[PDB]
């Protein structure tokens, strides 16, 4: 099991994959985002580094970055009916991770319990776990437990989003971990076995 030494090792690993902005920005909040990511099991973080994943922390909009300019004005998958486009999205995950500094908490342009953990969970799912959220086993769990964490007409509709949000509950803090264990016991056991 993880302990404070593992977390310090995780902070070192994250310092090697996180890309910070230059100039003025909320530097302490960016570092606080890293410290929340350091609670993720080190096995996942090590694998992200081995796969040369970069976690970009941004001081502006995602589409202000050169590599995401192509998404300007594009409606993200799953955002139909929001009235919004990628210009408004505070974080993305998958093959890359890009996150607006300061927008971590639920309601800051998104409804994840925590922006960076949800987005990094997607990257782990896709890059490290070969899209395990789409596996027959996780889909079976998702069908039963996917509506137990609120936002039921979004988390309960997309298995990849329920996976990422459950992962964020598991690792954000002790209260969200305990809440997940009570609300989604099969998902909790699934995530616990994954980190063995």
């Amino acid at each position: 099991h993880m302990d404070s030494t593992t977390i310090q090792q995780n902070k070192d690993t994250l310092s090697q994959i996180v890309v910070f902005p230059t100039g003025n920005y909320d530097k302490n909040e960016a570092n606080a985002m890293v410290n929340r990511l350091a609670n993720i099991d080190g096995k996942y973080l090590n694998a992200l580094k081995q796969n040369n994943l970069k976690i970009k922390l941004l001081s502006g909009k995602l589409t202000d970055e050169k590599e995401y300019a192509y998404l300007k004005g594009v409606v993200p998958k799953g955002w139909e009916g929001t009235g919004k486009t990628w210009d408004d999205v505070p974080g993305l995950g998958g093959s890359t991770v890009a996150l607006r500094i300061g927008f971590s908490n639920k309601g800051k342009g998104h409804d994840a319990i925590n922006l960076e953990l949800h987005a990094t969970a997607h990257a782990i799912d896709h890059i490290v776990l070969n899209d395990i959220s789409k596996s027959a086993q996780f889909k079976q769990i998702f069908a039963k437990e996917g509506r137990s964490l609120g936002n039921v007409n979004f988390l309960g509709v997309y298995p990849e989003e329920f996976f990422a949000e459950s992962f964020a509950y598991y690792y954000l803090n002790q209260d969200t971990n305990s809440k997940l264990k009570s609300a989604c016991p099969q998902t909790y056991s699934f995530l616990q076995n994954l980190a063995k």
């Binding site: 995950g93 998958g94 994840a112 949800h118 988390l155 989003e161």
Partner: peptide, 7 residues
């Protein structure tokens, strides 16, 4: 793979 945060 590209996925936005939950709306």
């Amino acid at each position: 793979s590209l996925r936005p945060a939950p709306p």
